[PDB]
From a paper:
DHOase catalyzes the cyclization of N-carbamoyl-L-aspartate (CA-asp) to L-dihydroorotate (DHO) in the third step of de novo pyrimidine biosynthesis. In mammals, DHOase is a part of a single trifunctional polypeptide of 240 kDa, namely carbamoyl phosphate synthetase (CPSase)/aspartate transcarbamoylase (ATCase)/DHOase protein ([name]), that selfassembles into a hexamer of 1.5 MDa. Almost all of these enzymes contain a similar binuclear metal center consisting of four His, one Asp, and one post-translational carbamylated Lys (Kcx) residue. A further structural study of EcDHOase indicated that a flexible, dynamic loop is extended towards the active site or moved away from the active site when CA-asp is either bound to (loop-in mode) or moved away from the active site (loop-out mode).
For the huDHOase–5-FU complex, the crystals were grown in 0.1 M MES, 1.6 M potassium sodium tartrate tetrahydrate, and 200 μM of 5-FU at pH 6.5. In order to investigate the binding mode, we solved the complexed crystal structure with 5-FU at a 1.97 Å resolution. The two metal ions and the R1475, N1505, T1562, R1661, D1686, H1690, and G1703 residues were involved in 5-FU binding. Similar to the malate binding, 5-FU can bind to huDHOase via the loop-in mode. When compared with apo-huDHOase, the dynamic loop in the huDHOase–5-FU complex was shifted by a distance of 10.2 Å and an angle of 40.4o for 5-FU binding. Even though 5-FU is a nonsubstrate ligand for huDHOase, the flexible loop still did not move away from the active site. Additionally, R1661 and G1703 in huDHOase also interacted with 5-FU through water-molecule-mediated hydrogen bonding. As determined through the titration curve, the Kd value of huDHOase bound to 5-FU was 91.2 ± 1.7 μM. The Kd values of T1562A and R1475A bound to 5-FU were reduced to 146.5 ± 2.1 and 161.5 ± 1.6 μM, respectively. Mutational and structural analyses indicated that the 5-FU binding mode of huDHOase differed from ScDHOase and PaDHPase.
Residue numbers in the entry: 1460 to 1821
Write the structure that this text describes.
Amino acid sequence: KLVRLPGLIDVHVHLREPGGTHKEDFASGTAAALAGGITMVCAMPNTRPPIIDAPALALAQKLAEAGARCDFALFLGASSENAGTLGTVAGSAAGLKLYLNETFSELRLDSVVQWMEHFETWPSHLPIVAHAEQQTVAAVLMVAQLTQRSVHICHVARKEEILLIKAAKARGLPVTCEVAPHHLFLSHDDLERLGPGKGEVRPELGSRQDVEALWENMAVIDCFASDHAPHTLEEKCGSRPPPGFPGLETMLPLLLTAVSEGRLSLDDLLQRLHHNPRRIFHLPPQEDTYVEVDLEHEWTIPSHMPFSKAHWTPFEGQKVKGTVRRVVLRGEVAYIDGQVLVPPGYGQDVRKWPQGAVPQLP
Ligand SMILES: O=c1[nH]cc(F)c(=O)[nH]1
Ligand SMILES: [Zn+2]
Ligand SMILES: [Zn+2]
């Protein structure tokens, strides 16, 4: 029989609009979200132009309100120049994103003093999330401690990183983290199939011991989040391949397969794709919204899923069990067995809902 799930939330997607709309756009990316059982997305700021100032945020808001099919919030991006400038618009964003390592990003902050300046100037009650790999996780945690506030670590991929976060949580430090499906379901073993172009992602694919360590430390993982990072196959297979994988349409099917194999419970899944995203990012509930899944249907991931403009997937050939049958978003059928039924522009900026503002002391 079907199982009804609440509206799932992905706090880490790249929708590529503005400036990279051949890779994705709000319409195609949120179509891919609905097809993956996702009714609310938080979109990263590494677009063209990047969302690193009030005018770029206003532009992206309209673009999102016109093209998004599911609901959304938009990240602001930290830059080497905008610390202390974001106070009037900070509350309207999903949170502040820091790029602390090299990746598909023009926003790297090279001095730790720039990190501190952001942690000090960004309103302390609003989320800060970091792309922070290996020792950079410990470095950014230190900055959070010096500035006495929380931090959220994006796509944790390594035994090294999850064990460090585990030690920090055991000392009572306010740190949360997310893990992406490719770091749970792929590894070095797959680089031969993928090749060095397709296989290019940051954080890179881990060893089998990295993958095993994340599964063993499920209790340390607060959120699953796709880091949906679409690029075209041409780009992935070209001279300088940009890192990243598309993932909205495969994330939930992969995770449902793990559930059916007894590797985690349905509750563990709902904690990490609904409750914890809500509470870490202060995201509002979605009225009359739910996802119906079929845990019985077995299928094989094809060479590309229907909706993402990436038109490729590193999970090709994996056998999954579990499929999104229907999604209702705020009282409308949004998706059924491969058909997206709400138009571009149906989706709304949740930070403009009364319940979607982050509460704060006057
Ligand atoms: O972390 C990321 N890697 C690659 C990307 F294209 C992107 O948007 N984000
Ligand atoms: Zn990243
Ligand atoms: Zn990302």
